[PDB]
Amino acid sequence: LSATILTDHQYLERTPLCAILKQKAPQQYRIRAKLRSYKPRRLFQSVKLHCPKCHLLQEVPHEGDLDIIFQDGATKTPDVKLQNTSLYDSKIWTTKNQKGRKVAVHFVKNNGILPLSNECLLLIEGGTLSEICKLSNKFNSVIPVRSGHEDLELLDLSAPFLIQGTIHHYGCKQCSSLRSIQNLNSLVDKTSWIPSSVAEALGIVPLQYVFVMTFTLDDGTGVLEAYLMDSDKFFQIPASEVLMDDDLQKSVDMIMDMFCPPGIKIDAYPWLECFIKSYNVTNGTDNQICYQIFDTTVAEDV
Amino acid sequence: EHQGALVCLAESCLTLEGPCTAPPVTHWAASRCKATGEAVYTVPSSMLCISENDQLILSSL
Ligand SMILES: [K+]
Ligand SMILES: [K+]
Ligand SMILES: [K+]
Ligand SMILES: [Zn+2]
Structure with a gap:
């Protein structure tokens, strides 16, 4: 045969x-x-x-590259960006013996309310790869973000723009024209987190x-x-x-x-x-x- | 409250005291790290690209 x-x-x-x-x-x-x-x-x-x-x-x-990107991404001073209050709720955790790093987690709301964890999209600033992997198992999706001058923004496209379960989604650096995180507001349907919808909202190919x-x-x-x-x-x-x-x-x-x-x-x-x-x-x-x-x-x- | 529960769930995934732990490594991921000394196999993008004109001819068959 x-x-x-x-x-x-x-x-x-x-x-x-x-x-x-x-x-x-x-x-x-x-x-x-x-x-x-x-x-x-x-x-x-x-x-x-x-x-x-x-x-x-x-x-x-490589997995090691992502590990380094997220380690290098550690920050003492993450912003909430208060203009985005209707988009997400935010928490910041302080740390012990981790060079004063902070982790910010932003919980995206569906239709004004926080959804169930398996339906919840997270934005994270200052997390390690290991933390991001764990969050991706317990929540729907994770978008790594950084505090820009005006708004939250994606990290360099060398990191996944979205981690959903164990799937790492990447964007094209030539074709994308990134939009800041507030543009997630343009999603009328937040009842599911479709990777290509996140991508379109953020100007990612x-x-x-x-x-x-x-x-x-x-x-x-x-x-x-x-x-x-x-x-x-x-x-x-x-x-x-x-x-x-x-x-x-x-x-x-x-x-x-x-x-x-x-x-x-x-x-x-x-x-x-x-x-x-x-x-x-x-x-x-x-x-x-x-x-x-x-x-x-x-x-x-x- | 549900917000509180989500915050607790999020916290449980974080390592906030001392060193952070290691994510899982599969056998291909480990191998990708060990493959040194010879250029990684690749194909120039142009070799894989079927032109629009060729795609036109091909779809008519
Ligand atoms: K022969
Ligand atoms: K034979
Ligand atoms: K979509
Ligand atoms: Zn492209």
């Missing part, structure tokens, strides 16, 4: 790789190939962030988590390099959750080991059935053809 199946375009005839490589882009194809090799070999490096608007691809900040991989595919007629840029179709594992979950990570590892079992020859690898599109890439003076996998998923008996 094939290791992957098409989720669409099943009517297509199979095209051999040698024929694809001789043809002009853009075209769509069905293929059957062995996965000869892939990048990244270090699978933990496959998780990237991609902007749907400007097309940039970037790294997800959210980045999308993707698995990015380079598949070297071989059917014996030729070798074709095809990119995978997958949010959750291919592995049936959400790229937005994978970095926070040992079991999801283990599943991706097991899928890839299944495509390329160690110490056996390529003929003994499973076939991958894939749909691919070809397209033209220009990096200055010369043209190049590239290939991407679409409408393809891992099969049931892994």
Whole structure:
């Protein structure tokens, strides 16, 4: 049995790789190939962030980076910003033996009242990563903020603009034009906290988590390099959750080991059935053809 | 009061005396920290970008 199946375009005839490589882009194809090799070999490096608007691809900040950002963000003097009284209630806690740091927590109100904890959005200034993670478990969502000159503002977009459960949402630094926190007032519906609604209110273009991989595919007629840029179709594992979950990570590892079992020859690898599109890439003076996998998923008996 | 309860819940997540604790680290997160000495795998964004014109031709198929 094939290791992957098409989720669409099943009517297509199979095209051999040698024929694809001789043809002009853009075209769509069905293929059957062995996965000869892939990048990244270090699978933990496959998780990237991609902007749907400007097309940039970037790294997800390391956990250690966030830890440092939040440590560096410690403040002795957080503001409530009193003009925002109808938006949120606020509390500030003092500390012992923590260099006089303070934590401000702002509790966003739904329709004039504080909602249940699981429905409550928090804004936090001066919290550690560990505190933010705990708050994200007990409340609906956390937005890290800092005291600006006039209003509360998001931290640098290198920190998540929203943490909801264990999902860290990031914004594009090129495409966003940040609005201050008071603009959360423009949300008429605060009965749920939809990440894209928070993002629009704050002028953020959210980045999308993707698995990015380079598949070297071989059917014996030729070798074709095809990119995978997958949010959750291919592995049936959400790229937005994978970095926070040992079991999801283990599943991706097991899928890839299944495509390329160690110490056996390529003929003994499973076939991958894939749909691919070809397209033209220009990096200055010369043209190049590239290939991407679409409408393809891992099969049931892994 | 409910406000009081939310404030107590929030407080319970905070570490207000001495050093703060360590957030959980998954095996990929730990590995991402240890992968040194070779440029991290990436693909230039332009290699992944299918132009509007190419997308037009492709959608008609
Ligand atoms: K939305
Ligand atoms: K051959
Ligand atoms: K075989
Ligand atoms: Zn962008």
